[PDB]
Symmetry: C3
Subunit: 104 residues, 3 copies
């Protein structure tokens, strides 16, 4: 009975640069340590420096990964950022050539 | 009720000219969806020398996640502001978003955007 | 009879920085040369406490390649990138294919799969 309804999701988080370390630890602890980080800038509702964290998940429920990031990135002040979950159709593991959720 | 984006969430991703960022920012504010995330990127589009075949040109990736504003209106606002009429103007893509979380409050779904 | 079931897909690849040149060539050869590149860093899946410490603090430099496709099957684009980026060692990265609903060509105002 597979998480993410047997499929693959991209968890994209825009967070405070100084919260990256915590988020990395939280991802490891939740059992989905894989991430890709980009230096970015933006604004919510003159651009502020942020970090975009991307985690593609299959074995771990996307919401649990997102909640792990949210908790670790939370301060309670404006600028904490947002997390978005996008569908992923397919994945390929470059080293092996394995496909689908098994490649994640 | 008639919520835009069929009651859901969309990611508007635009690859534009670096010097068009200021205009795009203004256009986004004016259309009522000012939120954006910017990345410095490089790329090339479709097919003598190396200029328009192999080399990568500096661009800006603009990402806007929307719910209250129709994705197409946000995309049109970016397109208009980024337009010059010359090769290199870039492209805008709209991707589905399933779910969202506002980190400060823990609010979820379309309300988080 | 249109590829990608008549629709649009985003091919996202996280690869070794030194494999970018090869991937660019492979994309041209497969007939879908369009790409957007970002400098990124990350880590993959998880004995000693030092190599365990190096994991929890250290991110490795990678390149994110993004190709939005319509006329070329997303899998063929992904396979072209995979082949060119392959070394057989840990760190080779991964390729993800995401659905795309719509696209706008900024220059012309053309929309849909035709804008890709
Ligand atoms: N809808 C969105 N689309 C794209 N990027 C966003 C969006 N919302 C937030 N971001 C990114 O997250 C960063 C901070 O977001 P945040 O929501 O904290 O802004 P804010 O104006 O402080 O809002 P709030 O007061 O509700 O926290 C922004 O700099 C931006 O890069
Ligand atoms: N299918 C695509 N996938 C990813 N990025 C793209 C794609 N098409 C365009 N881009 C981005 O847009 C930037 C420039 O715009 P574009 O490539 O559309 O102009 P062009 O193709 O050179 O000219 P024209 O669109 O008039 O043929 C490129 O540097 C690239 O980063
Ligand atoms: N699930 C994922 N989500 C986001 N990014 C990922 C994911 N998996 C891998 N990456 C990106 O790809 C890069 C290399 O990944 P790769 O999977 O080759 O590392 P690895 O897990 O050590 O190798 P292997 O998969 O062969 O065990 C990482 O640095 C990371 O940025």
């Amino acid at each position: 009975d597979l998480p993410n309804d047997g499929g693959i999701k991209l968890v994209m988080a825009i967070i405070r640069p100084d919260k990256l370390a915590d988020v990395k630890t939280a991802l490891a602890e939740v059992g989905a340590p894989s991430l890709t980080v980009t230096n970015v800038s933006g604004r919510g509702s003159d651009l502020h420096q942020k970090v975009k964290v991307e985690c593609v998940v299959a074995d771990t429920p996307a919401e649990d990964v997102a909640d792990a990031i949210a908790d670790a990135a939370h301060t309670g002040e404006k600028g904490d950022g947002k997390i978005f979950i996008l569908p992923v159709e397919n994945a390929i593991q470059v080293r092996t050539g394995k496909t689908g959720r098994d490649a994640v």
